[PDB]
Design a protein around this ligand. Structure first.
Ligand SMILES: O=C(O)c1c(N2CCCCC2)nc2ccc(Cl)cc2c1-c1ccccc1
Ligand SMILES: O=C(O)c1c(N2CCCCC2)nc2ccc(Cl)cc2c1-c1ccccc1
Length: 134
């Protein structure tokens, strides 16, 4: 497994736990209603240790870029400014966000040709499945 195997455009086809995860994050209702109903594409690109992840939908588009293994300031969809690190480890992209004494982990992996995105904060979990599209 390589980080390059995660590259491309992926379309959300299933989500579980996402509203609960946003509630744990303390996201307000206007942002939570957008996320319950947006069906974004995720575009992952990686040039060596450079990674970009863009999330696109008519409702909301976000994008960050980083160097694998380096701490950086990520502005999240809900407007947090986190210290984030992304690494490709044990066949998954692992993203750890820290802010205000809090932490959340986001993983992205290839399973059965699908992109499986999992999030957690304080044992509140979500799983989002995306299918590879042109
Ligand atoms: O899908 C997301 O990127 C994603 C997200 N992710 C889920 C994927 C894993 C990392 C956290 N976390 C969020 C937290 C708060 C809010 Cl308001 C939106 C998101 C979105 C998001 C959803 C729809 C359109 C654009 C962005
Ligand atoms: O109708 C809503 O539930 C509702 C809503 N409010 C907030 C609370 C009470 C009722 C309406 N607030 C929102 C805020 C942001 C966005 Cl993107 C959508 C909504 C919708 C909504 C609109 C269309 C389809 C489904 C839901």
């Amino acid at each position: 497994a390589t980080v390059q195997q995660l590259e491309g455009r992926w379309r959300l086809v299933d989500s579980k736990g996402f509203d609960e995860y946003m509630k744990e994050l303390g996201v307000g209702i206007a942002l939570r209603k957008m996320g319950a109903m947006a069906k974004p594409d995720c575009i992952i690109t990686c040039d060596g240790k450079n990674l970009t992840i863009k999330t696109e939908s008519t409702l909301k588009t976000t994008q960050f870029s980083c160097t694998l293994g380096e701490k950086f300031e990520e502005t999240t969809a809900d407007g947090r400014k986190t210290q984030t690190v992304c690494n490709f480890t044990d066949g998954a992209l692992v993203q750890h966000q820290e802010w205000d004494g809090k932490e959340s982990t986001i993983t992205r992996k290839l399973k059965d040709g699908k992109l499986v995105v999992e999030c957690v904060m304080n044992n509140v979990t979500c799983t989002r499945i995306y299918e590879k599209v042109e």
